[PDB]
Amino acid sequence: DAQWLTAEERDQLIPGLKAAGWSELSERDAIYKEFSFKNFNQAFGFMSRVALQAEKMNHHPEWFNVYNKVQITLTSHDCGGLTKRDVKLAQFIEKAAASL
Amino acid sequence: DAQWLTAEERDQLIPGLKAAGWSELSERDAIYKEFSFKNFNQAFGFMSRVALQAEKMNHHPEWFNVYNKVQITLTSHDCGGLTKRDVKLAQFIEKAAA
Amino acid sequence: DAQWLTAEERDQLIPGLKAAGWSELSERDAIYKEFSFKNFNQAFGFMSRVALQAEKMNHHPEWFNVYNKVQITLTSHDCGGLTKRDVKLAQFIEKAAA
Amino acid sequence: DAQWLTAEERDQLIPGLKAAGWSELSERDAIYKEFSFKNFNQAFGFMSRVALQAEKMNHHPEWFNVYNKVQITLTSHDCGGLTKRDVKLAQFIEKAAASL
Numbered sequence: 001d002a003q004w005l006t007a008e009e010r011d012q013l014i015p016g017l018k019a020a021g022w023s024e025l026s027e028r029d030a031i032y033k034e035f036s037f038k039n040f041n042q043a044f045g046f047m048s049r050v051a052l053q054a055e056k057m058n059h060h061p062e063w064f065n066v067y068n069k070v071q072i073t074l075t076s077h078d079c080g081g082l083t084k085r086d087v088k089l090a091q092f093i094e095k096a097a098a099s100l
Numbered sequence: 101d102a103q104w105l106t107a108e109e110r111d112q113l114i115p116g117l118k119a120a121g122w123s124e125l126s127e128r129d130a131i132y133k134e135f136s137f138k139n140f141n142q143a144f145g146f147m148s149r150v151a152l153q154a155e156k157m158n159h160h161p162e163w164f165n166v167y168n169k170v171q172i173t174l175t176s177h178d179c180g181g182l183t184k185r186d187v188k189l190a191q192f193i194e195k196a197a198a
Numbered sequence: 199d200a201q202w203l204t205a206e207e208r209d210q211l212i213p214g215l216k217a218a219g220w221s222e223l224s225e226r227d228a229i230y231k232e233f234s235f236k237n238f239n240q241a242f243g244f245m246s247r248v249a250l251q252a253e254k255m256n257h258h259p260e261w262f263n264v265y266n267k268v269q270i271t272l273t274s275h276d277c278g279g280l281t282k283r284d285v286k287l288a289q290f291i292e293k294a295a296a
Numbered sequence: 297d298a299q300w301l302t303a304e305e306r307d308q309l310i311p312g313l314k315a316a317g318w319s320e321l322s323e324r325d326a327i328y329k330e331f332s333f334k335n336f337n338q339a340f341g342f343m344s345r346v347a348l349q350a351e352k353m354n355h356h357p358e359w360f361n362v363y364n365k366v367q368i369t370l371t372s373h374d375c376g377g378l379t380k381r382d383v384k385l386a387q388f389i390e391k392a393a394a395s396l
Contacts, residue, residue: 040160041348044151045392048246049341051144056253056337060140062166096341099395141254145247145294148344152239155352196243238356242347249340258336264358 001084002076004029013087020094029082030062030075031090035097037068046070049096050089059085061093101184102176104129113187120194129182130175131190135197137168146170149196150189159185161193199282200274202227211285218292227280228273229288233295235266244268247294248287257283259291297380298372300325309383316390325378326358326371327386331393333364342366345392346385355381357389 005013014024014031022033037043047063047070054060062073072093074086105113114124114131122133137143143165150172154160162173172193174186203211212222212229220231235241241263248270252258260271270291272284301309310320310327318329333339343359343366350356358369368389370382 040151041155041345041352044348045341045345048148048249048344049337051140052250052253052337052340054140055250056256058254060167062164064162064164066162067160141247141250144250145243148246149239149243151344152242152348152351155348156239156354158352238347238350246344249336253337258363260360260362262358262360265356 002079004079004081004083005087009084010082013084017087017090022090025073028073028075029080030073031082031086032071032073033090033093035070035072035093037070040067043068043070046096050093053089053092053096057085057088059089061089101187102179103183104179104181105183105187109184110182113184117187117190117194122190125173128175129180130173131182131186132171132173133190133193134169134171135193137170140167143168143170146196150193153189153192153196157185157189159189161189199285200277201281202277202279203281203285207282208280211282215285215288215292220288223271226273227278228271229280229284230269230271231288231291232267232269233291235268238265241266241268244294248291251287251290251294255283255287257287259287298375300375300377300379301383305380306378309380313383313386318386321369324369324371325376326369327378327382328367328369329386329389331366331368331389333366336363339364339366342392346389349385349388349392353381353384355385357385 017031022031025032035046037046043065047065050061062075064071074090075081076083076085117131122131124130125132135146137146147165147170150161164171174190175181176183176185215229220229222228223230233244235244245263245268248259262269272288273279274281274283313327318327321328331342333342339361343361346357355372358371360367370386371377372379372381
């Protein structure tokens with residue numbers, strides 16, 4: 001999905017992400033979550049998996065990393081809002097963070 | 101190097117990095133530079149090379165990435181300032197970016 | 199492309215790759231090339247770029263690595279032969295290696 | 297350790313690796329193990345972690361990858377045999393494969 005999520009889609013997709021720890025940013029139609037690992041080795045291994053998925057689906061995250069911390073913000077710049085692509089990427093990220 | 105850069109060291113090593121595009125932050129004793137690649141494939145390949153060097157040196161960057169852009173801030177948190185480790189990592193980053 | 203390369207396609211696309219250092223295996227319809235970098239940092243950075251492209255194309259290489267060396271064999275297992283996917287991945291590999 | 301493992305060291309270090317699935321190659325003083333993941337994404341994420349450790353310890357593996365399979369052979373070419381460095385790398389690899 002390249003268009004903004006509908007009210008119905010948000011009610012059916014966001015609750016699960018919120019339950020997983022993601023939050024909706026106050027200033028942008030985007031979701032955000034910070035992941036913490038044991039060290040940089042584990043953090044970057046995680047980032048490499050996310051990077052691979054980003055190229056597989058042609059959708060990229062905004063992210064900041066400092067050693068074992070990875071802060072991720074997902075939104076679609078081509079339309080300026082949250083799309084199904086962001087939800088899909090978030091779901092993959094949760095799998096990667098859980099080693100699944 | 102693990103100790104803060106002396107005045108002489110800064111004069112000898114920082115100008116080259118500034119000529120290469122790095123700048124010194126005003127609120128912190130740290131250097132910064134935004135790199136712009138063609139796409140994320142190039143950007144992450146570059147990040148992977150920097151990540152390898154980070155573990156080789158046990159010195160890590162503070163960095164942000166969005167598609168083809170990579171913003172890097174370097175400083176030594178252990179002593180709260182710039183050290184030769186930051187200079188060496190920045191020099192490696194320049195080679196990897198080229 | 200997902201179907202086996204035709205005679206015309208092979209004549210049009212393979213010579214360039216051979217000029218670049220790729221060779222055709224004798225026991226399989228596949229192309230091969232060993233890349234030699236300066237070190238593992240360069241080699242793995244290169245591998246990371248190829249890995250990203252592999253997932254973008256959903257087409258994977260058969261590769262071996264030891265420090266600065268990376269041996270790559272390309273073929274399409276789905277049909278047991280060379281396809282345009284192999285040619286396109288090889289061309290990307292050439293750019294990444296440069 | 298940059299020298300070959302002693303008979304004593306082999307008796308105290310190899311059993312654990314054998315128990316983990318590693319085997320001693322017949323033609324070389326090296327250890328070998330094949331790892332299988334769900335897909336290439338997981339396999340390469342694993343490889344990135346191993347790559348990071350290889351640069352951290354300045355010791356590199358011989359490895360072959362085809363999609364979800366990663367075959368790893370560990371030995372020290374600077375002396376032509378198995379060293380403490382190979383054991384250390386093997387132990388890290390086991391952690392990475394287990395997501396630890």
